[PDB]
Every structure is written in structure tokens, then in C-alpha cells.
Scaffold this active site. Structure first.
Site, PDB file in Angstrom:
ATOM      1  N   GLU A  99       0.852  -1.183   0.000  1.00  0.00           N
ATOM      2  CA  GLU A  99       0.000   0.000   0.000  1.00  0.00           C
ATOM      3  C   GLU A  99       0.898   1.247   0.000  1.00  0.00           C
ATOM      4  O   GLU A  99       1.466   1.579  -1.058  1.00  0.00           O
ATOM      5  CB  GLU A  99      -1.069  -0.062   1.102  1.00  0.00           C
ATOM      6  CG  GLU A  99      -2.188  -1.039   0.691  1.00  0.00           C
ATOM      7  CD  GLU A  99      -3.305  -1.208   1.688  1.00  0.00           C
ATOM      8  OE1 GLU A  99      -3.305  -0.499   2.729  1.00  0.00           O
ATOM      9  OE2 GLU A  99      -4.201  -2.066   1.393  1.00  0.00           O
ATOM     10  N   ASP A 131       0.507   4.795  -2.290  1.00  0.00           N
ATOM     11  CA  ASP A 131       0.967   6.190  -2.176  1.00  0.00           C
ATOM     12  C   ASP A 131       2.315   6.294  -1.484  1.00  0.00           C
ATOM     13  O   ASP A 131       2.730   5.377  -0.750  1.00  0.00           O
ATOM     14  CB  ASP A 131      -0.091   7.059  -1.459  1.00  0.00           C
ATOM     15  CG  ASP A 131      -1.505   6.981  -2.104  1.00  0.00           C
ATOM     16  OD1 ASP A 131      -1.669   6.530  -3.258  1.00  0.00           O
ATOM     17  OD2 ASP A 131      -2.468   7.359  -1.409  1.00  0.00           O
ATOM     18  N   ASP A 180       0.831   9.217   2.814  1.00  0.00           N
ATOM     19  CA  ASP A 180      -0.603   9.388   2.991  1.00  0.00           C
ATOM     20  C   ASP A 180      -0.824   9.975   4.389  1.00  0.00           C
ATOM     21  O   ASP A 180      -0.898   9.248   5.384  1.00  0.00           O
ATOM     22  CB  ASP A 180      -1.319   8.048   2.813  1.00  0.00           C
ATOM     23  CG  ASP A 180      -2.808   8.129   3.111  1.00  0.00           C
ATOM     24  OD1 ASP A 180      -3.348   9.251   3.241  1.00  0.00           O
ATOM     25  OD2 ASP A 180      -3.432   7.051   3.240  1.00  0.00           O
TER      26      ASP A 180
END
Ligand SMILES: [Ca+2]
Lengths: 555, 555, 555
Positions: free
Chosen positions: B248, B281, B284
Site C-alpha cells: 500500500e 501512495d 498518505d
């Protein structure tokens, strides 16, 4: 014999729990020394480590007001995890609100008084200046306090203090060389500086660093240097450090005479560091006294050799961040300095106060500073310097008349931001090396390229090139306008091209009989009005330079 | 007695090779504890360290799926060299090629499946969104896996984990304060976050940091925080860290409600760090949910006090680098934020996605992002913000119609780069503080200073000032031209000075009878054509504002 | 039995004071090994650590010329505080003055000769090029010296050397992986590189880093890599490092063939580092040989696949500072590179020498470089690159004709500084995305927006828009002027608006009969002089494109 084998196969460490005094444990130690019980020390208690290279591991507190003095540590000695704590719980002030707004009113600051070892600091005399009137309003029990629990490393070479912490805590390296304060684990400060390299006696300090870590609070500066010179090798200074809420400044090189000699500093690094919410300044890297300076420099270069504020300090200064100063974000003096990559935000006094000469500043950002109007400007430069890249203005407005940059002897290029141009004062401003340009206008029915001659007016544009919409959006039509100021009225006189999509040039004429001197160049004409005949005339300077008057347009 | 002297002179350390369980060794330990054999733990195995301040030195592996739980460590405890490894070798995907190009096609990603503890990650539900269609195409044995070997530090204060590593490894600090993950030695991640500070129960987390080091892989985010508040002192966050190939995001502050309370975070530092090749990302740093948000914030400020995306998050954000994101480089929300010195390069989604209001962004570089057209733009800002310095465009082209910057409520200054001006949308763009200017043109026979009124047209310049060569190179002669758009044809109408080195001004005239309203200002004239007499006329607005028509030029 | 309990409760450490050789101590060691006496080693002396995971703590010196070779250390082994020192005191040169000015004259350099282990370096053959003539002038006893005391870690995985120092000292990792040189404590270098990761045999080096710390002196480069590839994970390189006074370069990736194979390097990080006063270069990150290059690349990609200087090196390069190089500040080659946030100041050769193609450079500052005119320019770029943000010029002048930037195939935006525009050479220069503009002029009676067509002239502006004061300061009046070059005389021909506050436009006319071709556009007129009648005429291009000549103004 087991004892022979045991002496060979096991690591040596003495531990304080086996001894009645710290000196007894130090004397017993050969390799390791473990601090495994709290130890109450008396101020000035002095431990002699016998020249031994010791690995001192701390798992308990040193408790006492005053100084615990370590001497005669061997080169390569290390002290880890030390925790200093005062016996006294002093009165502290907390000059900020629960929303992190600075308090500036003396009575409001006095109202914050509490007895604590942290979350504030003991007032000192500098608070009398910072919060005017507070000297009269402070109760006597909150004035003149002197509580610090200080680990003093005295006259040692090659000693490192790692992961230190504490309450009302300080760390002093007195007459040391090649020593480091590494990864400070957020000690909460007392009355004295939190981390000090002081070399007023003996050789100039060298090899002395703060590397990594952070500090909080303290009455005065977080990290400070007196009489250190890193040499051309730049062997010392502050790298990777964070200071929070210094009672004075985050990082300070001392100025002027202390005792009988110089406290100044040369050839240090100040890099990759952050100062947040100092009561005074973020970085104070000056060497000469600003207000009421000494007429001499005992122990340093004479004034005859280098004038005040023009010492060849030669620090290596790069990649610094300051936010939230109640004083000045970044201050220095010196001549021949190079400074790069400095970011200052949200300071109540000037973002930068630069008493520098023949110095270069590259990629500087001063963003929303002087927010309380404490100084005359956001960035000040006294001497003849160069600024290459200067970001000005965040989101704050300025209601009064203060300047943004006052650098009257300096040449500047590369300003960005929504600066009010009337608040710029420099010797010369230029963009010599731009490419082909486009001015893109949003939220207006026109685009503009304006000119302002500051000698004529700092507040009024003297001429402009505009493009203006004809009709509305999507009309595919605009008019271009070339203007000049007259009678202090911007855009008073203008020539237009394509007004109302007419495809023609609208030309201004002299509204009465033109004087001979109104025409500048040969082989040019100047139209003017003859009201008594309803005619345009032309004042003509012929190719040979002689003047003639002609009829240009008639009924 | 030798034993008396031995007990005083030797360092204490217990070692796991002498004990059948980790708890037995922990109970025996007094100062040091050495992990000198591999240790197979069961998930949930819990060790009670008795409040002791222990120096735990690891020279072997902790092996197991699930959590090894450390409790009741004394303040100042340290765990060095720990190595976590799963017992299970799961199925992992590797969505990049041997030339480091991202794979986006679900079938291509499925084809990468292998059983390994590294060089890829276990799919999770977020992969179903990232690689559309992959949910249907993944074999069942590659869905819903849950392999991580996690060192859990539970409800401890002042514990540091240094130089940790592993395979399918995670590190969890649950309900901890003043704890640090230092110099992570590139652990390869598993299903859960690699480094987590989670404080959903008890007091808000404070003093919790990732300092230095790096991580690789993992199914989700590399470093993450839930319910931490660093205080005004900014005592926590991420400094000096590198994340590679997060499944992630590199660094994440959680958003919204988790369980029954807030997962949000305040007052943390995010500095001097790098995120490379995250699947989602880089950073974040948002606190509120973007898509389908909660209508409330249990445990946090209510929506009535601060609207969605307008929390006073107050993070200290500076000197960040992101390269190679398949998602967004840098994302955040909040109101009143200051952000500086952010560099984002080569991202497939937006370089920056900023749901911020009344915030300031200084010295931002967004270079070759949105390279796969995943978002509407390279940098988006929703609210009324200020951008001071914005570098746009590296070497990539953009074939479609997407915007480069869409910041419709923001005021911007200091754009640099080969941006297509039609792809800029801002509230206001200005360079208020430039000096004397020069436009230098290379590779053309002209130089240009153009104007574009975006309300009129985002794609066509509305007027220009040009300089054009007369003849060839070295001729010493050029002509200057002032132009205006008509009928959506740039440069349709123009005035020239020195065309063909003639030394004269070429003046455009209205090609037919000028209407009264075509003239703008008093004491000006507008030439126009009278075809029926082969004459130029002048529409004259006299000095008194009244109109008269005169003959200007005749046969 | 006490011995049973003692073996369980005490930390194991062997110490060199108990053994006659280092191998005897190494063989005895199980956990710790303490170096507690100075140890004289012979060159090539080899210690076998038996695969053991050892914590080696050094509190004394390893003394010897040549290499002390450590082998068969277990993964996770650590060596702290090591201090290497030569037995020989060689002859060293010190090519800088007591005011830190570089010496360039060979005879002056020879005069600095002294016998010391520090404060200078042993000459090598590269000095013959750097100080021309020095080869003839050096005494034989100062040529061809080869003194270094080197700790060699041979064919180990997962070994870290921390806080190393020394005199005439070097550190070599030969055939190692996942090894680190951490917090180097300013070793003073010898003849060989101070820190070397050399992987010419076996697998490509990976996981090898210099993290933190600093070095001084040495005859050649401070930190260097041969045949390392960090992988897409970028697992290796140099982070947080300082080099002072390298005899060659601060940080070097080797170029070309060494022995029978490639010495080149891929996928490394070069970040957050500083190089000061190198005799050659700050960062030398090239992979192919510049002068007299190999026609092949044994062990690497062939020339047929990637031409010279076009390797896909893919390093991660960010946040670098160089000051004081006698050679080049920052040099590299490669294709497809991204480089950001580079600052170079006060170098005697080029600030940057970039043999790069299809590469992007963002936020580059080159400030007062090529100060001794050693190269043709301050920044050179050979291939077709993009530069987004380039600061040029500090406070130094340039007396000769050298270029500032020569990047003839590159497209550049965002130059700031007092660059001489004649010293810019690029393929294209543009500011496409500026807002509404203001030119602010200080220290002049005018403001200017100038145009320069470099194809026409690199030294003369081709046209201008000026604003000039009428009368004096505070007059509220200025005139606007639009000019064009003729006969290589800038501003030769001009139109004025409001000269002498006349409120009219002064229009230039052709000083003789205008030729047909002098008029460009339809529906325009061009005034010209008819001397034989004292009349202005108008050459008219009618709306239909046909020419007619009219009388414009008459006696
Ligand atoms: Ca006439």
C-alpha cells in the site's frame, strides 16, 4: 582452575549497586560500568576515571542540583542513557496557550506560574526584555532561580554522550575536544544551556558536535558553543538536531567577550537541523555583539583587521528549518559567507536578520514572519550581499507599513510569492536569464506585464503592457494596451491595438500645442491638437535633426 | 571468596541457549539477555520481563506465524538485531517487470505468482481495486492469506527496537509511549504493516518514532500511526526513513473510525524521508475519509467544530522525496498546514492530492507524474491555499486533455518548467516581485513575451510582444511587434517597429468606417479606411471628450 | 556449583590482552571480543572468525602497513571503534595555504612537503596531471609511496563497521554483501581509498552502504564502489556522509574495465551527503570512461546495446552539497536519470559536468564555480536533457569569455541569478507558466523588459519595453518606450508614449522613400519622409492587400 578460565572468558563490568560512592565504582571499573541504582550527587562532586577507556551504561538517575563532574576519561569512552534530575522543583512560566498561541502580555505570562520540573522554564533576566513589565509583576520567588542538574565532562578528549535525557537537565563539555552529544533523547532543560561546548580556557575547541536527537524547554539556548574552531576541515557543529521551545535560542554561537577572552566560533557546520518555537531565535550564528558592542576582541582578531560583523567565520550552513519563533528565525553576521537552503516559517519577529557583507544566500524561503511586527521587516541584510532565490509570503496579510525585505546594499534575483512590491527594498533586482515568457492571468478580464521604477514611486506602477477581453469569454478577441503614468495616475496615457475588435491602433496626441522639447528622436513625429482649427498637427524632428511643424489631419 | 569478587566484576547476561522457553530466560535476566539460538514461538506467546531494564541482543531468529508479545519491559530497555520469520511460505505477486516497469494488467499480475517469503507480497482486498479484474482471476489459494511474523511490544514506555530485520516480518507497538523503531535493517514485510504505532486504547500515543533505516515489500503500508498526538513539542513521527515497494503506502497516518474510536493523528513530524515504488501512495498524511466518509468522529473533534478534511492536524512536514508510485506520490488533508521542500518524480497517479484549506506549500516539485492517467491531474488542491514555488514537468509528454495543476481556489507564484499553459487551473497566478527582466530566445528567429487571459481562452494567447530577426543571423537588425487576437486567430492585429529595417512604425487601421464607440480615450485618434475616396480618416476623441471625424491621408 | 551458575549468568567476552595473536583471541571468542591492547599486525595477516556472530569492541590500535584481513564473520557481526595506523610516516603534500586558498603552482606544492601521517597526502600519478610540472620537481622520496593501514573485510555477509578511525587508514570490503560502514569517526586516509566496496569477483555487490560519519585526507577517493548493483530496491550507496579534502574525489563510482571485468555500478543511493575541498571532484557518479574510452564493456552491457555514457545507471540522487572542489563539483553520465536538489558552491573547475542523455535535473544550484577557468564552463550537459530550476552566480565575476551554462541539446526553465545572458547556451529556454508579471527596478531611472534573440546576437538585446522617469523622483510621470535594434545598435528605433509628460505618442517614420516591401500586413500604413516637399507620406497596404501611396502630413 575455574577462576583463571572465568577471568578470560567473561566481560568485565562494575556496577554502582556494589559501591557506596560513584568514585568507588569508577575506581573498580576496567571495561564496563553500569549505573543500576539512582545516585544522589552533591554539586561539584568529581569522579576521576583514571584515564580508562570506559563504556558507561546508565539504567538509573543521577539526582542533584548543580554539576556532576567527570574527569580523566580515556579517549573512546562512551556514556549511554544518562538521566539527570534536579532535587528542586522550581517555579516555571509557560508563555503559550492551549491552542499553541504565544502569550506576549506580561500579566498573562505571570498567571501561568506553576512549580514543575518541566512544561515551562525558570524566568531569567532576558524575560524582562521579552515580556516588558514582567520584572515588576513576577513574584520574588519566581525571579533569580538557578536550578539545573548538569553532567559536566571536564578536559576530556574523545568522549561521547549518547541517548541522554533528564528533567531540569544540562550537559556541559568544558575544555573538551573531539567530543560528541549524540542522539539526545529529549532532555527537558533547566536554567543553563541544555548542551554546551565551552572552551574559554586551553586550546580552541575542535571536533565537538551535536549529532541527532532533540531537546525541549530550558531557560536559555538548547545547543551552544564558546571558543570553538572546526578548522578548514569543519570538524564540529550541529548536524541532524531538533530544538523545541528553547527559553532563548535553538542553536547559538556566542558573541563578544566572556570573562577575559573571546567566546566566538569559526569553521563549524550547521546542517540538516530544525528549531521550533524558540522564545528568542531559531539559529543565532553571529559572533559580534549588535547592541552596545565591545570596542575590542581580546583573544580574537582585532577590530583594525576585521570591522564589527565582518569576521571570516566561514561556517558551513545548509538545509535548516525554523518554525514558530517568538524572536528571529535565522540570524548571523560575518563577511564572505555562503548560506544555502534555509526555510523559515511563522515567526513573530524577522524571518532572517543578516548583519553580513560580501556574502551569498542561495534558495532562501521566508514564509509568514514578523507576524507580530516586532522588527522593521521580515528579512534584513545590512551589507553588500547577493541573494539568489528568495521565497516571500505564505498566507498572512500585513496591515501596517513594514517592509518585507530591506537589503539596501544587496543584489537579488528570483523572488517568488505574493509580495507587496512596495515592501521590497534592495540595491538591484533582476531576472537576467529568463527564456521566452508567458503571463497567464486567472480571475480577471485582463493580463498584465507591469513596470515599476522604485526611484519614482514604490507604490505606483509607471507603465504597463495589458491585454483586455473585448466583449465576453470565448469572443476570440482582445485589445493590447501600452500605458504610462502621468500626474501620479497609473495608466493615464495609453496606446491601444484592437479596442472593441476594431482592428486599428488608437494613438494618443498632445492635447494642446506641443513644445519643441517634447519630441525626443530624429525621424519621428508627435501628433498634437490645434483647437482653433479643429486640426491635428505633427511636430516633426526630421532625419537631419531639425524641427518642422506640419498639418496631419483636417476637417 | 572468588564468587564474591566475580559477582562484582563481571557483566550480567542470560542467554536463551541455557533455557527451554523464552519466559525462563526473561525471568533469569537482570541486565543483558542474549538470543543465541533460533526460537520457535507460538502465536500469542507472551513474555513478562518483570519491569526490568534489559539490553536484549539478538543473534538468532524468532520463528513463527503470528505475534510474539513482549510485556513489562522497563523504561530504557533496548532490543537489537531482532529477526522475525514466518513458518509459512505464502503465495506472493510481483507486479513489476525485469526492467522495473509496473504491471497494471490483472492477468499479467496473476502470472507472476510464486511461493516465497519475499520478492513480492500477499494479495489483499485493496489489490482488487488496484488491478481491476484480479479478484476473479486469482486462484483461491492466493486470496485471503494472512502470514506475518510480528514482534509486538505491548503497553511499554521507553523501549527501542534497533536494527530489526526479517522475512514476512512485522513490528507492532500497541499502546506504547516514548518508543522508537531505529535503523530498521531492511525487513521484508508480510501481510500486516511493517512498522505500526497503534494507540486505539489508553492515552493518545506520544513520543513514538521511526528514526532511520528502511523496509521492503509488505502487503500494506511500511510505517503507520493510529491515534498518536505528538503535542506542540512534535514528539513523534518519521525522520530519516526509506520505504521500498510497499503493497500500500510508504508512510501512513490512518483516517476515520477504527473499531469504536478515532485512528487519526496530530502533531507528528514527517521529515528527511524517502518513499520509492509504493503500489499505492508515497506519503498518505490525511486524517478524514475521502470516499464515503463517516458522518461523525467518535473520540475526536466533531464535524460541527471542524468540517471534513479541515482538522488542525499541525504536522511538521519537510524535505520529503517520492519516486515511482503506482498511486499518488504525496497526499494529505487538513486546515492551516505548512508544508515545505517536497519532491515527487515519476508517479503513475497524481504527484500530489491535497484536500487542504488555508494551507501553505513552499518549494514543491512535481516532476513527471500521472504518467498512466489514473487521476484527473498531476497536482490537485481542493481548498483555498497558497503555493510559493512549484516545479512542473520533467521530460514526459501528455497526449490527452488532463490538467497538470487543478487548484481552483488557490493562489500560486513561481511555476518553473515546460508546462502546457492550457493545463494550469488556479484562482490567481502572479509574479509580483520580479526585477528588470530579459527574455532570451534560443532555436528561433524570434523572442516572445506573451499574454493569456484564461477567462477568454485557456489555449490561445490574447496578445504578445515579439522581437523578430530582419534578414539573417548577425544582421544587427530586428523588428518589434505588438499584437492582439481577433476571431480566435492569435496575432491577428499588430503594430510593428523597424520591419525590414525600415526604421518606421507600421500602424494598423480600421478597414472600414469606424463606429463612434471604437475609440476609448479622450485626446486620442483612431485611423480608419474610406474606400470610396482612397483616403485614411481619423476618428478623434478631442481633449474635451467630444468626437470629430477628420481626413488623415489623401491621394 | 558456582561455575554452573556463573557460566549461565555472565556475558561472554574474550580480550586480546590474554592472547599472543589475534587469531588465538578470535578462536577463543564466542559472543564478545575486546581489543584492549595495541596490536602490531603484518601485511596480509588473516583472521578466521569461524562463522561466529561476534561483537568486536575496539579500545586500542591495530598498527601496521598493509592489510589486516578478517574472514568468516557470521551475519550480524559488528566491529566498533577500530583504529588503524601505519608504521611508516610518509612524505605528504599540503596543496592549500593558511588562509585555505588552493595552491596550484607545482613548485609551491613541493615546498609544502613534510613527513606526517596526516595534514596532507602522499602524491600519486594523478597529482602529475593536477599540478603540471610537479612530476619533475618532486624529490624521488616523495614519489611512488604506498602507505596505508587497511582493515579488510573479505567475503562476508552482514558485517557492520561502526565509529572507525585511524591515521593513514583505509577500510576495504572485498567481495562482501549487506555490509555497512557506519558513523566513520573521521579517519585520516592513506594511499588507497578510505572506504571501498569492491566486488570485481563473485556476485555483484548489494546491500553495501556508507551511512553517516566523515573522513579526512587520503591520496585518492574517500568512498568508492566497484561492481555494485543495489537492485530496483536501491539497496546500497552513500547516505548522510561527509568527505573532507579527498586527494581525488569525495564519492566515486568507478568507470570502465578493471582487471578483466566491469567496475561500474547501478541502482545505488547518493543522498543527504556533503563533499568539501576535494582535490579532484565532489561526486563522480559516471560509469563510462571519458578520455580514451574502452571500445567494449566486458562483464557489462555491450556498446551495441547502450552507447558510451548512455547506461541505465538508475541511481537515486538527491540532496547533495559540494563546496570548494579544485576539480569538478558534481559529475555523472548515463541515460534516463532523475537528479534533484543539488547545491555546488565555490569550485575551481565546473560546478557540474553532465555527460547525460534523456535525463531530468530539478532544483540545481551552481554558485561561483569554474573560479580558476579550468573548464570551458560552470555547468556542461552533453545530451538532450531537461533542467527545471537552475540557480547561477553568487558574488564572483568572470573576466574572460567562458560560458556559464553550455547545454546545447537541453531545454531549460527557471534560471535565477545575475547571469551574463551572453554566457547561456541551451537548445530552448522558456517560462511558459508565469502569472501576471511586474518588473521592479532599483538604482536606475528606468525599468526594462528586454528581448534577446541568440541566433541574431548573444551579446545585444534585439528589442525592449522600457519605462523612464520624466523629470525627477516623485514627479508622478514616466514615458514608455518600445524599441528595436538596427545596425547592431540596441534601441536604435523607438516609439514613445508620454515623453516629457506630453501625453502623446512619438512615432518613428522611414527617413526616406519607403520601398513596397517595407510594409508587412494588410490594412496598415507606414509613414515615410519626402524631403523634396517637406512632407510625410504613408505607404498603405489596403484591406484588399493592394498598395497605395498617400500624403499624410504637409506644410
Ligand atoms: Ca494628413
Amino acid at each position: 582452575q575455574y577462576s583463571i578460565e572465568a577471568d578470560k572468558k567473561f566481560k568485565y563490568s562494575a556496577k554502582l549497586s556494589d559501591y557506596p560512592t560513584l568514585q568507588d565504582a569508577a575506581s573498580a571499573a576496567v571495561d564496563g560500568l553500569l549505573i543500576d541504582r539512582d545516585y544522589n550527587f552533591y554539586g561539584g562532586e568529581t569522579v576521576d576515571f583514571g584515564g580508562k577507556v570506559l563504556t558507561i551504561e546508565c539504567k538509573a538517575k543521577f539526582i542533584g542540583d548543580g554539576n556532576l563532574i567527570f574527569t580523566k576519561l580515556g579517549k573512546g569512552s562512551r556514556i549511554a542513557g544518562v538521566f539527570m534530575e534536579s532535587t528542586t522543583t522550581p517555579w516555571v512560566i509557560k508563555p503559550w496557550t492551549d491552542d499553541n498561541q504565544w502569550l506576549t502580555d506580561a500579566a498573562a505570562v505571570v498567571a501561568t506560574l506553576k512549580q514543575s520540573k518541566t512544561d515551562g522554564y525558570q524566568p531569567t533576566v532576558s524575560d524582562y526584555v521579552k515580556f516588558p513589565g514582567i520584572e515588576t509583576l513576577l513574584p520574588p520567588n519566581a525571579k533569580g532561580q538557578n536550578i539545573t542538574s548538569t553532567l559536566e565532562i571536564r578536559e576530556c578528549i574523545g568522549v561521547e554522550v549518547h541517548r541522554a535525557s533528564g528533567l531540569m537537565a544540562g550537559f556541559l563539555f568544558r575544555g573538551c575536544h573531539f567530543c560528541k552529544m549524540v542522539d539526545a533523547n529529549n532532555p527537558s532543560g533547566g536554567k543553563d544551556g541544555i548542551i554546551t561546548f565551552e572552551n574559554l580556557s586551553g586550546d580552541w575547541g575542535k571536533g565537538n558536535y551535536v549529532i541527532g536527537g532533540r531537546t525541549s524547554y530550558g531557560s536559555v539556548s538548547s545547543a551552544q558553543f564558546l571558543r570553538n574552531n572546526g578548522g578548514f576541515e569543519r570538524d564540529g557543529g550541529v548536524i541532524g538536531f531538533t530544538s523545541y521551545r528553547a527559553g532563548e535560542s535553538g542553536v547559538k554561537t556566542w558573541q563578544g567577550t566572556v570573562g577575559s577572552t573571546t567566546s566566538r566560533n569559526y569553521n563549524l557546520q550547521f546542517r540538516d537541523s530544525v528549531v521550533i518555537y524558540p522564545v528568542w531565535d531559531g539559529f543565532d550564528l553571529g559572533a559580534d555583539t549588535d547592541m552596545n558592542p565591545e570596542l575590542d576582541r581580546p583573544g580574537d582578531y582585532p577590530i583594525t583587521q576585521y570591522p564589527l560583523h565582518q569576521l571570516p567565520l566561514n561556517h558551513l550552513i545548509d538545509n535548516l528549518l525554523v518554525r514558530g519563533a517568538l524572536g528571529v528565525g535565522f540570524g548571523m553576521d560575518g563577511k564572505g559567507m555562503y548560506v544555502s537552503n534555509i526555510t523559515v516559517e511563522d515567526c513573530a519577529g524577522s524571518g532572517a536578520y543578516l548583519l553580513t557583507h560580501e556574502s551569498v544566500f542561495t534558495n532562501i524561503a521566508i514564509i509568514d514572519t514578523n507576524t507580530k511586527d516586532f522588527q522593521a521587516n521580515q528579512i534584513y541584510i545590512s551589507g553588500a550581499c547577493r541573494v539568489n532565490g528568495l521565497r516571500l509570503i505564505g498566507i498572512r496579510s500585513t496591515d501596517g507599513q513594514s517592509l518585507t525585505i530591506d537589503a539596501p546594499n544587496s543584489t537579488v534575483s528570483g523572488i517568488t510569492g505574493m509580495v507587496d512590491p512596495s515592501r521590497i527594498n534592495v540595491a538591484n533586482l533582476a531576472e537576467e536569464g529568463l527564456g521566452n515568457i508567458r503571463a497567464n492571468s486567472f480571475g480577471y478580464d485582463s493580463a498584465a506585464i507591469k513596470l515599476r521604477i522604485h526611484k519614482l514611486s514604490k507604490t505606483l506602477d509607471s507603465g504597463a503592457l495589458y491585454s483586455h477581453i473585448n466583449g465576453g469569454a470565448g469572443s476570440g478577441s482582445a485589445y493590447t494596451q501600452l500605458t504610462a503614468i502621468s500626474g501620479s495616475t497609473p495608466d493615464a496615457v495609453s496606446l491601444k491595438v484592437n479596442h472593441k475588435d476594431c482592428r486599428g491602433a488608437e494613438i494618443p496626441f498632445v492635447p494642446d500645442i506641443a513644445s519643441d522639447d517634447f519630441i525626443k528622436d530624429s525621424s519621428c513625429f508627435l501628433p498634437y491638437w490645434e483647437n482653433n482649427s479643429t486640426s491635428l498637427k505633427a511636430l516633426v524632428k526630421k532625419p537631419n535633426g531639425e524641427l518642422v511643424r506640419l498639418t496631419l489631419a483636417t476637417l
